Enzyme design. Structure first.
Site, PDB file in Angstrom:
ATOM      1  N   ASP A 231       0.818  -1.193   0.000  1.00  0.00           N
ATOM      2  CA  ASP A 231       0.000   0.000   0.000  1.00  0.00           C
ATOM      3  C   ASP A 231       0.860   1.253   0.000  1.00  0.00           C
ATOM      4  O   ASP A 231       1.374   1.637   1.046  1.00  0.00           O
ATOM      5  CB  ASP A 231      -0.916   0.005   1.228  1.00  0.00           C
ATOM      6  CG  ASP A 231      -1.793   1.231   1.298  1.00  0.00           C
ATOM      7  OD1 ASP A 231      -1.830   1.979   0.298  1.00  0.00           O
ATOM      8  OD2 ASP A 231      -2.461   1.420   2.350  1.00  0.00           O
TER       9      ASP A 231
ATOM     10  N   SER B 269      -0.479  15.738 -11.784  1.00  0.00           N
ATOM     11  CA  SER B 269      -0.717  15.378 -13.163  1.00  0.00           C
ATOM     12  C   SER B 269      -0.938  16.638 -13.973  1.00  0.00           C
ATOM     13  O   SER B 269      -1.492  17.616 -13.493  1.00  0.00           O
ATOM     14  CB  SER B 269      -1.920  14.427 -13.273  1.00  0.00           C
ATOM     15  OG  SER B 269      -2.316  14.258 -14.620  1.00  0.00           O
TER      16      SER B 269
END
EC number: 3.4.23.22
Length: 330
Positions: free
Chosen positions: A35, A199
């Site tokens: 994770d 992004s």
């Protein structure tokens, strides 16, 4: 040193991925959920409330000759899906794919919430976010990657998640045969303890690329792609019959649909998520309403590049002094 381990979807939807991890002496192999959105290595154990164990493989510290109780230490964690666990802490030898850390904090669950109990395939989590998020008290503990870093050939690990298929976690090296083209690296903020990056925008199907900064985290522990409501609406508007359902808890779409791809920007580079990756199947058995793999982050407080996005890429988690993230097509 290096390590290399295969990671395998837990079910037909890729709801999560498990990776075998050797704990203790003799080795006890548990299948952990790696994770990059958390920083605790915790396991089902001999200490877990018996009624809360249903099919998981447990770690039994008393059978490990290298296990040592970390005196006074406890842990307690909650995840974004509302699941949780808590317990005490041992140190022990932990190996992943040939890579061995001695004195790794292994957090032994005394309690787990129902979602963990109900999932027989996940024996625990192995956190790969920054150690600043580790929940052990009163002495915070380091992640497996942090403990291994100095021994690694290169201070990196890579995530190569498969779509409906096995993939790979590598530690300490970049497999140049595992991706196409070049790796594009992008800046990381560790301020929230996550692999947080920005992004450069998105496209829907064959549509034009929208340049826009989207701050989010690279999170292998989250199944879906959670993005701003504007983006998500723009995506699902291209699917006939798709709608946001409060009763279901997100966007649903007719299972008869062919989904468009979704592209996200990494600097000047582009990662394309094929439409099939965005299909998470009937909302309930036999339903013709299907759950979408792109969902709104509104009310989460953060955008999440979960497995839906990450599995479309070869992802480098660069733990150099100034961490960065790299993405390649594959």
């Amino acid at each position: 040193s290096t390590g290399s381990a295969t990671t395998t979807p837990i079910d037909s939807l890729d709801d999560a991925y498990i990776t075998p991890v050797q704990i203790g002496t003799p080795a006890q192999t548990l299948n952990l959920d790696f994770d990059t959105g958390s920083s605790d290595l915790w396991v089902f154990s001999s200490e877990t409330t018996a009624s809360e164990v249903d099919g998981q493989t447990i770690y039994t510290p008393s059978k490990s000759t290298t296990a040592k109780l970390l005196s006074g230490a406890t842990w307690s964690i909650s995840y974004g899906d509302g699941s949780s666990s808590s317990g005490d802490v041992y140190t022990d030898t932990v190996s992943v794919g040939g890579l061995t850390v001695t004195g790794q904090a292994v957090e032994s669950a005394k309690k787990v919430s129902s979602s963990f109990t109900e999932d027989s395939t996940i024996d625990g989590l192995l956190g790969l976010a920054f150690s600043t998020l580790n929940t052990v008290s009163p002495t915070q503990q380091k992640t497996f990657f942090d403990n291994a870093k100095a021994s690694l050939d290169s201070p990196v690990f890579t995530a190569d998640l498969g779509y409906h298929a096995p993939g790979t976690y590598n530690f300490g090296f970049i497999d140049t045969t595992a991706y196409t083209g070049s790796i594009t690296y992008t800046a990381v903020s560790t301020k929230q303890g996550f692999w947080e990056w920005t992004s450069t925008g998105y496209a829907v199907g064959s549509g034009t690329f929208k340049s826009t900064s989207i701050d989010g985290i690279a999170d292998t522990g989250t199944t879906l792609l959670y993005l701003p409501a504007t983006v998500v609406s723009a995506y699902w508007a291209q699917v006939s019959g798709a709608k946001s359902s409060s009763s279901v808890g997100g966007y649903v779409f007719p299972c008869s649909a062919t989904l468009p791809s979704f592209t996200f920007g990494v600097g000047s580079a582009r990662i394309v998520i094929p439409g099939d990756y965005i299909d998470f199947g009937p909302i309930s058995t036999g339903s013709s309403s299907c759950f979408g793999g792109i969902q709104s982050s509104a009310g989460i407080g953060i955008n999440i590049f979960g497995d839906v996005a990450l599995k479309a890429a070869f992802v480098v988690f660069n733990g150099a002094t100034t961490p960065t993230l790299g993405f390649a097509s594959k």
